């Protein structure tokens, strides 16, 4: 399988330093990444122009993986929502494609972000997972100003094998996540 | 323009000078 920088860096620098700080007695005890799930709760495409192949074409370029649909679980009056209506996209990244995405995310995306002052320290699950939001998909390198019709950001969920926020915090900072406080 | 101080026509209006109307 693929040799990439972050995947390599995890085993080489992140792994040992982690075993240092928390002193695990088993290799599998030490924090790992399981999956990063990307989401676009969209729903602007509820009725209107429920043609969002433009964003599925977007997310497919960002992650090299075809997103799946999300549809309404229940109908909602105030939101103008028929049950089963197509209102969002979700792609689940594991293994190599997970690293490659995070790799470009940490090295490129967060920098290009408007007035970036560091990731939110407090967006930590409690069970050692992490979630963050994006206002724009232009934040990535593979999406030029030209090929976009409208601003559409996303939800980003990263799951760890950790049990506490503290091991999770360390695993992620050691990988290269920039926290403000 | 005549209300816009940062122009030639503008400072003639006020009857003052500066970088945007030199003497």
């Amino acid at each position: 399988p693929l040799d990439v920088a972050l995947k390599r860096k995890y085993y080489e620098e992140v792994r040992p330093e982690l075993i240092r700080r928390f002193g695990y007695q088993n290799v599998w005890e030490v924090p790992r990444l399981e999956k990063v799930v990307i989401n676009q709760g969209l729903g602007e495409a509820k009725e209107d122009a429920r043609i969002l192949e433009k964003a599925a074409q977007e997310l497919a370029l960002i992650t090299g993986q075809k997103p799946a649909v999300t549809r309404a679980k229940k109908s909602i009056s105030n939101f103008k929502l028929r049950k089963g209506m197509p209102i969002g996209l979700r792609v689940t990244l594991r293994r190599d494609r997970m690293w490659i995405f995070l790799e470009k995310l940490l090295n490129v995306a967060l920098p290009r972000i408007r007035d970036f002052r560091g990731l939110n320290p407090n967006s930590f699950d409690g069970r050692g997972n992490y979630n963050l939001g994006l206002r724009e998909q232009l934040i990535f390198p593979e999406i030029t100003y030209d090929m976009v019709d409208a601003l559409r950001g996303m939800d980003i969920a990263v799951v760890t094998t950790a049990e506490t926020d503290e091991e999770a915090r360390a695993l992620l900072e050691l990988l290269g996540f920039p926290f403000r406080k | 323009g005549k209300g816009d101080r940062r122009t030639r026509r503008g400072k003639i209006w006020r009857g003052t000078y500066g970088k945007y109307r030199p003497r």
Binding site: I100, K104, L106, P141, P178 | -
Partner: protein
Amino acid sequence: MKEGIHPKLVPARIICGCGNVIETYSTKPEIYVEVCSKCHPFYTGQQRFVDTEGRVERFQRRYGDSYRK
């Protein structure tokens, strides 16, 4: 993976404006960025860009000590 629904991954060349080049994989073989991890203000320690201000106000006026005592 399924075939015919997936954009294809290839070795990629992300270039920054500091002249950082990043070795990775992508759907596009060559990309240029405006900024990166290697040069960003918040990123590089605490390179406080245009303002190492310390305010400066408000004790800072000090013009001067010439009022009398």
